[PDB]
């Protein structure tokens, strides 16, 4: 099953740090911040091999009973199958601020202008090993 | 719904710190470490008013399809309705080590000799505000 933190509000001014390990033969895994598996304000997918996507980050939002919105992509990809990663996320009402394992950063709009989220989860071909949400 | 951290293994040598706030008119709330809502290796219930229990901690394990085992109790109760609390838990194969908001400690046996747990949750009349599991 997926790894999740539920109903511990991730609020404006708080920081989320997750650590994990990428599966050896991973296709892709995602880190998700939102309200449900069908309501995601910040989805960050890490694509080792997905169709034609290789070594790319793909970010988007998922709206309940509606679907995926406009994707954003980054070629920053400091991730290795079989290896640990760590990611830090903070946000204000306009922006999600993501910091990757190597210190590079990606930003993604806070499309709903949410000030808090009740669900953080990892899905796909990786596992989590630690979390700080505070 | 309950507040939980799921499928981020809480392993030997790691520490769990949760912060939260007790509901104003709370009867009781618990912090639980185990595998499911029916499989709990360390249940720590905080009883403000429960039957004849007032201002007491009650610790126990819950076995799946079996039920609650031998309760242990403590009168250490540095908790106030409406107020923040923080708790830190670590364990080895014999013992759960719990540290309360005021620095006092309670210990509870690791009855299964588990070296890792996939579920941490809070239930009842309180809410969580932060977590460090690392
Ligand atoms: O946008 C995030 C989601 O992408 C979906 O895949 C897209 C893909 O990125 C796009 O290039 C085209 O292939 O449409 C696909 C289907 O919407 C993932 O399938 C999805 O899980 C999210 O990662
Ligand atoms: O042992 C933890 C569980 O206690 C249950 O309550 C017990 C109670 O502590 C005991 O004094 C007697 O009243 O039996 C009750 C029922 O088993 C709680 O109901 C339960 O949720 C756990 O906290």
UniProtKB/Swiss-Prot annotation, chains A, B:
Record key words, sorted: Acetylation, Lectin
GO molecular function terms attached to this record: carbohydrate binding; galactoside binding; laminin binding
UniProt keyword annotation of Acetylation present: yes
Alphabetical list of InterPro entries matching this protein: ConA-like_dom_sf, Galectin-like, Galectin_CRD
Galectin domain boundaries: 2-134
Gene Ontology, cellular component aspect: extracellular space
Gene3D superfamilies hit by this protein: 2.60.120.200
Binding annotation for a beta-D-galactoside: 68-74
Subunit structure: Homodimer.
PANTHER family: GALECTIN (PTHR11346), GALECTIN-1 (PTHR11346:SF97)
Main function: This protein binds beta-galactoside. Its physiological function is not yet known.
Protein name, per record: Congerin-2
Organism (species): Conger myriaster (Conger eel)
Phylogenetic lineage: Eukaryota, Metazoa, Chordata, Craniata, Vertebrata
